[PDB]
Amino acid sequence: PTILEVSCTVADCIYSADFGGSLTLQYKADREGHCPVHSHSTTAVLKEATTHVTAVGSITLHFSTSSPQANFIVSLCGKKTTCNAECKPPADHIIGEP
Amino acid sequence: NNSGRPLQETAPFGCKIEVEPLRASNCAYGHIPISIDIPDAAFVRSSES
Secondary structure: OOEEEEEEEEEOOEOOOOOOEEEEEEEEEOOOEEEEEEEOOOOEEEOOOEEEEOOEEEEEEEEEEOOOEOOOEEEEOOEEEEOOOEOEOOOOOOOOOO | OOOOOOHHHOOOOOOEEEOOOOEEEOOOOOOOOOOOOOOHHHOOOOOOO
């Protein structure tokens, strides 16, 4: 599968040790199938690794980052979109996961 | 004979007054700071929601 167009929209992201960030991707694809998803930014990472894409659709992925801002590059099946949002400081000072 | 009017007819903020024990009930005044450590099992993942 390959996508003709894709878009990103990140909402209420929290920089945290856990996957405190959530973002929505929208895309237009030539065909359905399992596309890989990755965060090319060295300071952000997505929980989901792959998603079954559709000729058109949108998928929401969980992500985590240390950066106070969500200005990270996301890639779906190799295409890229610049996500960006002001992530808020985490609500709980301590968490049970590195 | 000269008791005036009881507090049940005179307390402000709409306080109802109950006896035994003396207390003000359903009174409406100011704001209550509230904090609630809701059980996180009650949330649903943003991706599943």
